[PDB]
Structure 1
Amino acid sequence: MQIRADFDSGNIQVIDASDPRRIRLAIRPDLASQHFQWFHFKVEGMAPATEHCFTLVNAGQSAYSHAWSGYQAVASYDGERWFRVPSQYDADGLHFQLEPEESEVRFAYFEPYSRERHARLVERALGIEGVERLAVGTSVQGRDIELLRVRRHPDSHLKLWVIAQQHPGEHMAEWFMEGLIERLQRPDDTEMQRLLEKADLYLVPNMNPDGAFHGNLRTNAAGQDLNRAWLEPSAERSPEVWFVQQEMKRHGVDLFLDIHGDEEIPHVFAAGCEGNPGYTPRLERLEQRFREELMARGEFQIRHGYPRSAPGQANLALACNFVGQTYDCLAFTIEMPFKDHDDNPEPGTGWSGARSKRLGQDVLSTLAVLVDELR
């Protein structure tokens, strides 16, 4: 048996794989930061009719170690069909078991979104009516940060922004973007016709290509948490954010959605700008409308989430808060679970790429309903 992670988004350190009943592995810290939680590795040469038992020995020292409870690892024999495996968490770490039907299998913290798939997503987007690559930024390591614009009418007046995966380990984020973009291929989509008559979409499928490729969880190549870099961005340390901010200054913003994934909470939720000094009655109302409409259409709830910010106590270094206040627009962080969306249990897969894609499509329906109220 051999274990490796020498591929896009791979992350693992092999401790000892000599005994199938006691496979010991360790998660690797981010390129330039102590954070870690995301893991992705491949196993080959496994013996048939043999139970294999894995342990991520340093799970207890991960960035969000409390989030391991209730979490089931994801696996795949072909890289296309992903399924959850029996998992437990204790002082020795995260454990999971599988009696593989095949000699090779891969495991990951979430269904991975490769940079190769990303290129295909962009390729597909550019083949869609009204879609153009408006601008392209460059990451610390030279990778592209495409900003796509969906514009089908020269007289639209609203700019709706959606960016994803600032935190590289939250792969559900780009899956959400794939679903959103793929919906644009539909003929006779009445809701989208209405939306695009009044608005243009500004999309960034992946905000941290370096981190994703390298299997990071939280930071870009330089070790910066991009979602804490908005108040003081740097063309050198956080070029990904510097880029988006420059483009926002050029075009304007009337709506902002920052797509993320949360390790702990087993529910899809959205966090707003209630702590912003600029949190006006207008924005408070729009936040209610957004949640009300999305809850009626997609896998989304309003009971569970992050503790709200006291009036005026928001951290303006976070994208949602920064963009919302700078542009006086409706702004949310959309958070999808690494576990399952417990309101609609599907244990075999837990939250998945497919469900992330669907949420992207349901969010589009929600935007179509609110477009007349954004300004």
Structure 2
Amino acid sequence: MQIRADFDSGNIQVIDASDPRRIRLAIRPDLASQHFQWFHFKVEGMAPATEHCFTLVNAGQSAYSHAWSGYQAVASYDGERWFRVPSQYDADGLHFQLEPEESEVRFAYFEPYSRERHARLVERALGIEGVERLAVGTSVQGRDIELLRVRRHPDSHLKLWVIAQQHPGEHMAEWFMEGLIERLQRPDDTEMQRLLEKADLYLVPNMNPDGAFHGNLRTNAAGQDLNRAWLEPSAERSPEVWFVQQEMKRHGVDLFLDIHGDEEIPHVFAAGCEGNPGYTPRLERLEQRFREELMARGEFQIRHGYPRSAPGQANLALACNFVGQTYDCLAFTIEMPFKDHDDNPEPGTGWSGARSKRLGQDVLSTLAVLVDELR
């Protein structure tokens, strides 16, 4: 038996894998920050007809250790079909067991989205009618930050921005983008026809390629939390955010969605800008419309989420608040669960890459409905 993480988005430290019934492992802290929670490794040469019991020993010291409770690890034999496995959490850490049908299998905190797939996603995007790579930024380690624009009518006047995965460990985010982009390949898509008549789409499939490649959870290569750098972006420390802000200034913003993933809450939800000094009645109305329309179409609810912000007490270092206020536009942070969307239980897979994609396409339907109210 051999366990490794020497690959894209891999993360794990092997303690002792000599006894299948007592496998010890540790989660690796981010490149330049103390945060950790995301894990991704492969096991090879497992004995057949044998139970293998795994334990992430430092789960208790992870960034969000209270989120472990109720969480079921994800696994895959072919890296295509991912399934949930029996898991428990106590003082010794996160435990999960599996009697593998195959000699090899891989585990991860969520269905990984590799930079390899990212590349194929961009390729397909550029092969789509009206889709272009409007501009490209560069990460701290020199990886591409594509800004794709979907434009099918030279007279549209609205700019709808959607960026994802500023936090590397939140892989469900890029899955959301894949679904959103792929819907653009439909021949007779009436809703999209209307949307694109009035607006152009500005998409950044991945805001932190270095973090994602290195299996980080929270920060970019420099150790900076990108969703805390919007008030004071750095060309050197947070180039990913700096790039996006320059382009936003060039073209303008009339809508902004920041796609994330939440470790704790087992529900898909959306946080707004109610704490912004610039939170107007118009924006409060639009936020109500958006949630109302999305709730009627996708796996999205409004009962659970983060505590709301008191009037004028928002943290403008956050993308959602910063963009919404700077441009006086509807803005939300979309949150997908690492667990399941309990409203629609599917224990065998929990929240997945597929359900993330579907949410991405449902969100497009919501935008089509609200396009005439944004401005």
TM-score (norm: length of structure 1): 1.00
Q: Any idea what SS the aligned residue of 1:15 has? A: strand
Q: Matched residues in 1 for 2:368 and 2:36: separation?
A: 38
2:316: which partner in 1? 316
CA displacement, residues 23-64 of structure 1 (integer Å, 9 cap, x when unaligned): 000000000000000000000000000000000000000000
Distance in 2 (CA, whole Å) between partners of 1:80 and 1:124 is 19
Distance, in Å, in 1 between the alignment partners of 2:310 and 2:160 is 27
Task: Tell me, in whole angstroms, the C-alpha distance in 1 between the residues paired with 2:144 and 2:329.
Answer: 27
**Aligned to 1:296, what secondary structure does the other structure show?**
helix
Runs of at least 4 residues off by over 2 Å: none
Over residues 166-210 of structure 1, what are the superposed CA-to-partner deviations in whole Å (9 max), with x where a residue is unaligned? Answer: 000000000000000000000010000000000000000000000
In the TM superposition, residue 353 of structure 1 has moved relative to its aligned partner by: 0.0
- Partners in 1 of 2:278 and 2:363 — Cα distance? 25
For residues 338 and 218 of structure 2, the distance between their equivalents in structure 1, rounded to whole angstroms, comes to 14
Instruction: Return 5+ residue gaps in structure 2 as ranges.
Output: none
How far residue 283 of structure 1 moved from its aligned partner, in angstroms, is 0.1
CA distance in 2, matches of 1:292, 1:29: 39
Cα deviation, 1:316-361, whole Å, max 9, x if unaligned, reads 0000000000000000000000000000000000000000000000
Cα deviation for residue 259 of structure 1 reads 0.2
Q: Give per-residue Cα distances to partners, 1:129-149, cap 9 Å, x unaligned.
A: 000000000000000000000
Report whether the alignment pairs 1:201 with 2:201.
Answer: yes
* Aligned equivalents of 1:174, 1:330: Cα separation in 2: 21
Cα distance in 2, alignment partners of residues 87 and 188 from structure 1: 44
Q: For the residues of structure 2 that align with 1:362 and 1:166, how far apart are their CA atoms? A: 22
Counterpart CA distance in 1 for 2:70 and 2:255 is 34
Deviations 1:220-264 (A, max 9, x none): 000000000000000000000000000000000000000000000
1:277 Cα shift?
0.2
Provide the residue aligned with 1:13 in structure 2: 13
Percent of residue pairs bearing the same amino acid type: 100
Q: For residues 262-341 of structure 1, what are the structure 2 equivalents within 5 Å?
A: 262-341=262-341
SS where residue 41 of structure 2 aligns? strand
- Whole-angstrom distance in 2 between the partners of 1:145 and 1:244: 9
1:111 deviates by 0.1
Whole-angstrom CA distance in 2 between matches of 1:323 and 1:184: 25
Distance in structure 2 (CA, Å) of the matches to 1:9 and 1:21: 26
2-side partners of 1:5 and 1:136: how far apart?
A: 29
Residues 255-301 of structure 1: per-residue CA shift (max 9 Å, x gap): 00000000000000000000000000000000000000000000000
Partner of 1:85: 85
Distance 2:308 2:210 in 1: 31
**Deviation (angstroms), 1:150:** 0.1
Q: How far apart are the structure 2 equivalents of 1:289 and 1:102?
A: 49
Aligned length in residues:
375
Task: Supply the distance in 1 between the matched residues of 2:223 and 2:96 (Cα, whole angstroms).
Answer: 30
Secondary structure, aligned partner of 1:21? helix
Distance in 2 between residues matched to 1:131 and 1:97, nearest whole Å: 45
Q: Secondary structure at the match of 2:113?
A: coil
Structure 2 residue matching 1:53: 3-state secondary structure: strand
TM-score by length of 2: 1.00
Output the CA distance in 2 between the equivalents of 1:147 and 1:197. Answer: 20
Q: Distance in 1 between matches of 2:247 and 2:70?
A: 40
The match for 2:100 is 100
